[PDB]
Amino acid sequence: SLVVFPFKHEHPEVLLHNVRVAAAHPRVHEVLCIGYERDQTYEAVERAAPEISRATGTPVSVRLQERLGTLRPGKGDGMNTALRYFLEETQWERIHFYDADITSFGPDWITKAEEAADFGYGLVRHYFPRASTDAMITWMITRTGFALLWPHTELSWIEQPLGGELLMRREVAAMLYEDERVRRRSDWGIDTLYTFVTVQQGVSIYECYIPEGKAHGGLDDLRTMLVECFAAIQSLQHEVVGQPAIHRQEHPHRVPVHIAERVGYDVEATLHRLMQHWTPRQVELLELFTTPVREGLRTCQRRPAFNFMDEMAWAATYHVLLEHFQPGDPDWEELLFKLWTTRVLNYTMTVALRGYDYAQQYLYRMLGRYRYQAALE
Amino acid sequence: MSLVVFPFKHEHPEVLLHNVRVAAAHPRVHEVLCIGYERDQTYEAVERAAPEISRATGTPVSVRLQERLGTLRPGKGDGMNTALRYFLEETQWERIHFYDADITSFGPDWITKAEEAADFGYGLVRHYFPRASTDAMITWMITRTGFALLWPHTELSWIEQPLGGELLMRREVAAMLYEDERVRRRSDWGIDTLYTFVTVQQGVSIYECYIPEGKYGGLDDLRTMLVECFAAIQSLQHEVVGQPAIHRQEHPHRVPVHIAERVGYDVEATLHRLMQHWTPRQVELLELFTTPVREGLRTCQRRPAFNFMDEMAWAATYHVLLEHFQPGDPDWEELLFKLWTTRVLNYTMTVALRGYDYAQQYLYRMLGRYRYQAALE
Ligand code: NA
Ligand code: NA
Known part of the structure; x- marks a missing residue:
């Protein structure tokens, strides 16, 4: 399982903390952080990366977002770049995204999402x-x-x-990565696109309730x-939208x-x-x-x-x-x-x-x- | 011995008359008094309905016009102080209630609860909502x-x-307030403030009844x-304020x-x-x-x-x-x-x-x- 943290302007300490949780998690095989440019923060995570990989036995990589779409170059390019990396440079079955700035992150977010995926769902969305x-x-x-x-x-x-907190099955990630409406949405629209396209394609969706909420x-x-x-x-x-979709939500x-x-x-x-x-x-x-x-x-x-x-x-x-x-x-x-x-x-x-x-x-x-x-x- | 007062101005006659009916039907109420701002539509409807309510309930329902007793805007103060003058000078009743003309949640319970707290010993009973x-x-x-x-x-x-204009006084508290010139002069909205202050200043013991349905x-x-x-x-x-006062409130x-x-x-x-x-x-x-x-x-x-x-x-x-x-x-x-x-x-x-x-x-x-x-x- 790959876990991705997209970042740009976030302070290093919060992202590094989250990286450490995800890397420590039994079911996580790799952590990827994706940033906009080689800045102070990007360098900090690159420096800290190897100490974390040795300590957890889990590879931690940093990469730059590439220009894959055609709108303002923002979150969509980051996430889509992570999709390519996951699809072309790994064989992991599942990918998680979490925003780099969440201050309430813990092993529970990962666990709940994986258990829901075990149950058969193509997409797991966290809600708060x-x-x-x-x-x-x-x-x-x-x-x-x-x-x-x-x-x-x-x-x-x-x-x-x-919400940018989610888990996809490899096949769902492939389908989104291949979809040109999604690939072009390089800006804040990416989450809307992932949401819309998964539903339109009859991917089955579970929504996990995260009680601590998302503090940013x-x-x-x-x-x-x-x-x-x-x-x-x-x-x-x-x-x-021509076909139904299985959609269930954890009772809040x-x-x-x-x-x-x-x-x-x-x-x-x-x-x-x-x-x-x-x-x-x-x-x-x-x-x-x-x-x-x-x-x-x-x-x-x-x-x-x-x-x-x-x-x-x-x-x-x-x-x-x-x-x-x-x-x-x-x-x-x-x-x-x-x-x-x-x-x-x-x-x-x-x-x-x-x-x-x-x-x-x-x-x-x-x-x-x-x-x-x-x-x- | 109990007088119930409804001071009124331009309220709809049916809400006021419903409340008058409730008060006069009450076993503990010996007379109902309505104090009108002026001879308006409301006042005429009240004066027409009165003798019939006296007959149906066997309780005297009197109507009068507020007198000019104070030196500020001629308002609520004059209305309430006129009711005090009457209570003290043209009746021998031992207790006076005041209720606003337009309370829509009025029942015999407002009267019973207040009468019961006076039986207990308090000089002043205030309702709160x-x-x-x-x-x-x-x-x-x-x-x-x-x-x-x-x-x-x-x-x-x-x-x-x-x-609040929903309250009950013992005769001696009413007399003390009517006699106080600071109070007699407060002919406007300040009257409630003056009543509250002077009773406390004089060490009158106060109970606050909670009315759940009130407001x-x-x-x-x-x-x-x-x-x-x-x-x-x-x-x-x-x-x-140089003396204490007993003060207790019903738990809300x-x-x-x-x-x-x-x-x-x-x-x-x-x-x-x-x-x-x-x-x-x-x-x-x-x-x-x-x-x-x-x-x-x-x-x-x-x-x-x-x-x-x-x-x-x-x-x-x-x-x-x-x-x-x-x-x-x-x-x-x-x-x-x-x-x-x-x-x-x-x-x-x-x-x-x-x-x-x-x-x-x-x-x-x-x-x-x-x-x-x-x-x-
Ligand atoms: Na691990
Ligand atoms: Na009566």
């Missing part, structure tokens, strides 16, 4: 408890898109379709990620108190940013949207406005964006960001303020209404 | 906060609903109550889910209203406040700022207000309003968003630190 105001891309972009475009499939039921400012920290996750859905929108535990009691973002800063980086093109682009959204966002030039951006207004908005949004156009990018920000604020003030349980319940029903709306049309 | 984490912002940030910073060694800041717009809706409740505390600040149930999952105010409207109705004198009055507060509120001329207004900034702010605020002055009232608004927003986004239990714990701890800070000094 999350704060009511985390996962706003997952919820408002990815799962929403899946519900609205493929309501009869497993896609919108997957818990963490953006304004909403604008997420803006590139948001743009690329949305572009990934938009790129897939005319695809057909009660959310831990310290996770239920996190705030996901700085509300003040987010309100402020909503009023910034406006341009006449952004103002003119709003003429594509429904009346309450156009007026709501136009208001945002002067003061934060977001009550208008409820569930149905968001679905209406999502449809216009699927049709008109252009990845790489700066005004479209900023507009998406503002529109999503008003959706996040609306949900924060009218749903998340009512409590964790209330929020979870609203989000699941949101998907249910989106699927039903899409299935009736 | 579960409340949502964004309700009771005057109670917490103004009244309980003031009680904690001004009389930390007393029972005052430990009282759960000092602003919109921008913060704007609470602006008049806010400025009058603050003025009430300000008007008492040099008073001394877990908050009902339907109450934990409410929202208390329109956030968007509140953020907007924070940027309005500036005057250059308000800008200049800010010069009296600490630097982060001065800078923070000044920013509110252009965008909402509130992160600065944590509990320590609020305590510093409260001291400046106690010293400088001018009741009845439009700029001072408006500044208090914005100042409290930033405090409620700060608490909403950094505390209440973390969940009900986190919020409750934070609030009780806040009073704890305010008592400690005040007693040390």
Whole structure:
């Protein structure tokens, strides 16, 4: 079994700690770290690598990501490079990915995933408890898109379709590595692509619950990620999903108190940013949207406005964006960001303020209404 | 011997009349009194329904108009003090209840529980109810906060609903309050504060009944109550409490889910209203406040700022207000309003968003630190 840690900007100590756990694990035959460039961190892990291999009897390799796709060169190139390495330079039967920066990692993540693979599943995804105001891309972009475009499939039921923590069977990794839609997704869209393509190909999926959760400012920290996750859905929108898929999830535990009691973002800063980086093109682009959204966002030039951006207004908005949004156009990018920000604020003030349980319940029903709306049309 | 009082203004007649019926049917209630603000629609409906309710229940149901007994805005204070005057001068009943006209959860239990605690010996019985984490912002940030910073060694800041209009007094407590000029003059929203304070100051023994079943717009809706409740505390600040008081509270149930999952105010409207109705004198009055507060509120001329207004900034702010605020002055009232608004927003986004239990714990701890800070000094 190969374990992969993609990294770029992470501090060395956290990645090295995780490497040491994975290398020590009885079922792990090799650890690979993949980075962007030979920096301080990359050199540190290269230096520390041989002490770790001798101590564990497990080979630890470092490699650079190669340019395999055609978008911004980010996470997708790293993961796809790991797929090639696993397929062409190893004979291991299974590959795990874990983000380099997870601070809650332990032998349990590896064990649970392997045991699920033993059971027969082609793909094992880890999922985690999350704060009511985390996962706003997952919820408002990815799962929403899946519900609205493929309501009869497993896609919108997957818990963490953006999660980078997962295990694949060799054959699943080969299928993804060979798929050109996946190979080209060199940016933040890679996780969406892996998720979508595995489901479309009827790979069987198990979702393991990891109770400790994943420990790793304004909403604008997420803006590139948001743009690329949305572009990934938009790129897939005319695809057909023609076959069922086995999909099961470990029953989740009660959310831990310290996770239920996190705030996901700085509300003040987010309100402020909503009023910034406006341009006449952004103002003119709003003429594509429904009346309450156009007026709501136009208001945002002067003061934060977001009550208008409820569930149905968001679905209406999502449809216009699927049709008109252009990845790489700066005004479209900023507009998406503002529109999503008003959706996040609306949900924060009218749903998340009512409590964790209330929020979870609203989000699941949101998907249910989106699927039903899409299935009736 | 027991009188039940419902002061009223513009409430819907059916809620009030339902409650009147409940009170008069109660075996322990000898007379029901309704005190009307003026001869409006509500008052006419009450006066029509009265003689029939007296006949159906064999209990006298009287209607009267609030008199002008105080020297401030003619409001709740006049209404309640008029009921005291009547209880004392035109009846011989030994106990008086007050209930708000529009409580929708009213039953004989509210009366029985209060009567039973008086039988036990208490001078004053106050009811208290579960409340949502964004309700009771005057109670917490103004009244309980003031009680904690001004009389930390007393029972005052430990009282759960000092602003609550659901309570029972023994005749001698009522007489003492009616006779007190500080109380007689508080014709506005400050009356509840005055009742709570003077009873404690005079060593009246207090019991708090828990009513499990008991209990919109921008913060704007609470602006008049806010400025009058603050003025009430300000008007008492040099008073001394030189005797203890017996005070016990019924143990509270877990908050009902339907109450934990409410929202208390329109956030968007509140953020907007924070940027309005500036005057250059308000800008200049800010010069009296600490630097982060001065800078923070000044920013509110252009965008909402509130992160600065944590509990320590609020305590510093409260001291400046106690010293400088001018009741009845439009700029001072408006500044208090914005100042409290930033405090409620700060608490909403950094505390209440973390969940009900986190919020409750934070609030009780806040009073704890305010008592400690005040007693040390
Ligand atoms: Na090993
Ligand atoms: Na009676």
